[PDB]
């Protein structure tokens with residue numbers, strides 16, 4: 001059946017220990033600001049948290065964030081993961097300073113820290129992921145393709161136990177960063193800010209004038225005169241009438257999008273993990289700004 005992965009708290013560690021890790025990540029995000037033409041490492045860390053969680057299969061509980069298996073070559077060389085090496089490199093000195101944190105805890109915490117420092121919603125986070133051996137590394141091909149339609153997106157996300165609202169909310173993370181032709185065969189940002197977490201993805205889908213064009217890798221993407229782009233999968237959220245209603249909702253309610261994204265993102269990062277009844281409550285980390293740091 002399904003594998004069982006029980007959360008086990010890094011020995012003797014508590015909220016204060018993880019806040020220190022959060023702070024080191026946040027401080028380095030501030031420090032290494034030049035990355036990717038001054039976008040900074042925020043977006044790639046969010047993508048790293050999603051990709052290391054998104055291999056999960058609810059049917060048998062393979063993949064998922066628990067095992068921290070991205071550290072192994074099969075997964076880091078996944079063509080779907082091209083570019084994430086930048087996120088992993090960023091995290092190296094963090095892991096060196098705090099060698100006690102598990103890899104899955106670090107990859108997932110990198111995502112939480114990035115969202116929050118980029119002025120996104122608070123994302124409650126739980127510790128206790130435990131490194132698993134190389135033979136537990138899921139095969140390539142569990143991450144989604146971008147050249148597909150709404151039916152594909154809907155079916156894909158059923159494997160991660162996500163419903164329509166959860167899918168649309170999670171996709172709003174595409175406010176962040178950009179596609180890079182050398183990584184994915186798509187080129188351009190989804191919006192203007194790209195290192196500030198807002199509902200701009202939805203506003204842009206609805207409000208820009210989009211043209212279906214071919215990029216330099218001979219792949220179709222939707223382009224706007226403002227210099228933004230949408231993947232076929234992004235654009236499918238306004239082609240499908242059920243997705244469209246939810247896009248409109250998030251475009252018109254920043255708080256609702258924040259609340260829903262926080263729930264879906266924590267869920268994504270926790271899928272596959274069994275938390276003991278007496279496990280600590282989820283942690284809500286203070287930002288550097290809230291700490292006066």
Ligand code: HEM
Pocket residue numbers: 043044046047050082083144145146147153170171173174176177178179180181183184185186231233265
């Ligand atoms: C249908 C599902 C999805 C597809 C097909 C997809 C596809 C892509 C592609 C092709 C890129 C560009 C990679 C590159 O060239 O560097 C990208 C970037 C990104 N994705 Fe997604 N994605 C999906 C869902 C998600 C989800 C659920 C999240 C998180 C909640 C996410 C977060 C990000 C972020 C933050 C970036 C920017 C990374 C950077 O700037 O380096 N994506 N995605």
